[PDB]
Design a protein around this ligand. Structure first.
Ligand SMILES: Nc1nc2c(ncn2[C@H]2C[C@H](O)[C@@H](COP(=O)(O)OP(=O)(O)OP(=O)(O)O)O2)c(=O)[nH]1
Ligand SMILES: [Mg+2]
Ligand SMILES: [Mg+2]
Length: 709
DNA sequence: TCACGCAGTATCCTGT
RNA sequence: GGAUACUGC
């Protein structure tokens, strides 16, 4: 009876079905002794709102303070008599909860006794600014259903969930193989310490042609590579694809060169030849339904691939468009909108991986075209089929087969790139750390991840989170450089996780600093307890540190090492974003004061460090917001290292959690301008010997807007 | 429906 | 005064 399944994606429709969340994932079946797709519909996720009592009764804001003390009974009576009837709410359940609060709404105390009202999602929605006579504010009016489910059930990222007493479905509701319905959200729980299951993956590449008359792109070939046991916690499987399927359709005008039959006969039996685009799209939809991939990967999938797929399906009236997704629906989502949210909805329940977004997030390249990505990652050369030659290729069997094989090779390249960067395992790790949905993580961006991280952190610690929204401050300090050429060892001292360590050390948090709705707030007292933001930051930092320790293992494979490096970078960025969102205008946690303070402290720190170095009678020639370059004026490497250690210790002696380390020893330096220099980093091998590696920072030579020559 | 912060260097244009 | 790029942290 207990349904144990691994959940990968969640989809909700705020307008069609209120209070229903469609989780999708994998379940284990002994009859087939394998893993099959499952769709669980959590129902009746009741709206929860919090009412804040007033200290003194106010005559509907007309007579102002009246002097009558207000208790929870007064608030409940006011809600039951006036608000409920006015806004057409039939049935609700109310209780009292003591909750804390520290955010950007004034007159809301730190810890207050709120009245929590729970009522179905079918009823209307109370206004945000609703003010009565006993309560001064209402929180949670527009909270989404998925957010409520995830936060209430403490679900963070893909994981194993147990459902008690599942129910079947009166009629089919999904294209999966197993379905269940949960009548309450309390029946779903998370079970920890279990391995992720394998997930099917389909890498697809399309080749189209632009019909000038309609200016609409028409599909002529599709290729797909499918793996049925792709892991989410281990290295990619070699080879990266198990099976494949290719479909080729004749254009609306041209005809085959009277030899396609023999060509396909002698080539292979896995190529399906169709005569009309309708048949091609139908066969593709049927194949997608049969394979049932949990991850669909491609290049420009959000931009061109899926948009053109849906457009052609609509134009050709191909039956059963919903096969492209995992939920059976009648009305297509509206074509348009920013990014690919319409495309995401069209493929609801199926994770979509655009290697362009992941490449932009993970690595840096001059261009993110497929050719450049293959050149830089896989180190291979990809041939390009001119757009004007695809149409003319329908004149010989050899050329058409070559076109189809080119599409196949493009799909293989996409899958190989996906495997190389560890897009999927890294996405899973980031999602688990943050707590968002995996599709959101793979769509790119940083705001959502930190938003959900802080949401979970605050909800777990008995807080009322804000309501979703419906050069502004000083930054770092860049010391004036002594531009020139230095032929002696240059010692670079860099701080470790500067801003996160500042947040931890000085205890900068929402609940610690006293903000007032553009001046730098005072540092919080040292007699308080560590807040939520510091603790979370610490966690992230520790994760990164552990990864670095792994990177330090001796005799490690190159590729694996690189992977670890990428991971480190990701985590660092996450922490930095946890800082930066504090000054993000459109963030759910806009706390510009706090961020300002952070930066200010950083500046102070740098200043102090510089002063100390000068008190040691050394020379300081550069520094960018956490670093100092010292002209050792020496040529004995060992001695330089000694000095490093010395100053390092000295600096550390002033701080508890902050740390400074030797970020590099430059044999020679060419310091041109602020944030523009070159050097020969010294990597010691042992016995006093060392190798030199060229390093450039900010020079035009490392910019993409100049001719390669 | 979206989207991390700020400091800094380089190039180019201002008619109806 | 403005506009367009992309480095640094
Ligand atoms: N908001 C934001 N801030 C950043 C980003 N990159 C760097 N910073 C800021 C915050 C960092 O604490 C500060 C110091 O830069 P670093 O590159 O030396 O990183 P950090 O010291 O945090 O760690 P590390 O020296 O690599 O161990 O610069 C970023 O991508 N976003
Ligand atoms: Mg640093
Ligand atoms: Mg000026």
């Amino acid at each position: 009876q207990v349904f144990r399944f691994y959940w990968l994606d969640a989809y909700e429709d705020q307008y069609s079905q209120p209070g229903v969340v469609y989780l999708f994932g994998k379940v284990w079946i002994e009859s087939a002794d394998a893993y099959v797709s499952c769709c669980v519909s959590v129902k009746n996720i009741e709206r929860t709102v919090y009412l804040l009592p007033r200290e003194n009764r106010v005559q509907l804001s007309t007579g102002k303070d009246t002097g009558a003390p207000v208790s929870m009974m007064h608030v409940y009576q006011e809600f039951n008599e006036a608000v409920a009837e006015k806004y057409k709410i039939m049935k609700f359940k109310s209780k009292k909860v003591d909750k804390d609060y520290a955010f950007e709404i004034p007159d809301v105390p730190a810890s207050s006794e709120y009245l929590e009202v729970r009522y179905s999602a079918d009823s209307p929605q109370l206004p945000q600014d609703l003010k009565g006579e006993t309560f001064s504010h209402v929180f949670g009016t527009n909270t989404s259903s998925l957010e409520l489910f995830l936060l209430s059930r403490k679900i963070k990222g893909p994981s194993w969930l147990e459902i008690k007493s599942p129910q079947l479905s009166s009629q089919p509701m999904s294209w999966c193989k197993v379905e269940a319905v949960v009548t309450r959200p309390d029946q779903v729980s998370v079970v920890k310490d279990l391995a992720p299951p394998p997930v099917v993956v389909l890498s697809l590449s399309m080749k189209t042609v632009q019909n000038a008359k309609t200016h609409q792109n028409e599909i002529v070939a599709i290729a797909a590579l499918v793996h049925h046991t792709f892991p989410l916690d281990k290295a990619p499987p070699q080879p990266p694809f198990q099976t494949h399927f290719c479909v080729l359709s004749k254009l609306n005008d041209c005809i085959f060169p009277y030899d396609y039959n023999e060509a396909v006969k002698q080539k292979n039996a896995n190529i399906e030849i169709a005569l009309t685009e309708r048949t091609l799209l139908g066969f593709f939809l049927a194949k997608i339904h049969k394979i049932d991939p949990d991850v669909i990967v491609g290049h420009d999938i959000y931009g061109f691939d899926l948009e053109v797929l849906l457009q052609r399906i609509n134009s050709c009236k191909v039956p059963f468009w919903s096969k492209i997704g995992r939920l059976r629906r009648s009305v297509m989502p509206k074509l348009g909108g920013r990014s690919g949210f319409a495309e995401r909805n069209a493929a609801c329940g199926r994770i979509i991986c655009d290697i362009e977004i992941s490449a932009k997030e993970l690595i840096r390249c001059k261009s993110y075209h497929l050719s450049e990505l293959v050149h830089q990652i896989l180190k291979a050369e990809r041939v390009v089929i001119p757009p004007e030659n695809i149409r003319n290729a329908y004149n010989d069997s050899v050329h058409l087969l070559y076109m189809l094989e080119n599409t196949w090779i493009d799909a293989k390249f996409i899958l190989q790139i996906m495997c190389e960067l560890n897009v999927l395992p890294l996405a899973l790790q980031i999602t688990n750390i943050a707590g968002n949905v995996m599709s959101r993580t793979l769509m790119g961006g940083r705001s959502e991840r930190n938003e959900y991280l802080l949401l979970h952190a605050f909800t777990e610690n008995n807080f009322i989170v804000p309501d979703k929204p419906v050069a502004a401050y000083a930054g770092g300090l860049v010391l004036e450089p002594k531009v020139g050429f230095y032929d002696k060892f240059i010692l670079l001292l860099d701080f470790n996780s500067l801003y996160p360590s500042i947040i931890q050390e000085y205890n900068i948090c929402f609940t610690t600093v006293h903000r007032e709705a553009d001046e730098i707030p005072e540092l919080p007292h040292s007699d308080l307890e560590m807040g939520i933001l510091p603790r979370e930051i610490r966690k992230l930092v520790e994760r990164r540190r552990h990864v670095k320790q792994l990177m330090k293992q001796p005799d490690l494979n190159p590729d694996l090492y690189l992977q670890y490096d990428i991971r480190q970078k990701a985590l660092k960025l996450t922490a930095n974003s946890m800082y930066g969102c504090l000054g993000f205008s459109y963030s759910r946690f806009y706390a510009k004061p706090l961020a300002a303070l952070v930066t200010h402290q950083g500046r102070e720190i740098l200043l102090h460090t510089k002063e100390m170095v000068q008190k040691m009678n050394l020379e300081v020639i550069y520094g960018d917001t956490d670093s100092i370059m010292i002209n050792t004026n020496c040529n004995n490497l060992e001695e330089v290292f000694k000095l490093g250690n010395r100053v390092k210790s000295e600096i550390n002696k002033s701080y508890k959690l902050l740390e400074i380390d030797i970020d590099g020893i430059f044999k020679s330096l060419l310091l041109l301008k602020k944030k523009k220099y070159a050097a020969l980093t010294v990597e010691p091998t042992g016995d006093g010997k060392y190798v030199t590696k060229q390093e450039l920072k900010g020079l035009d030579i490392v910019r993409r807007d100049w001719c390669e020559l």
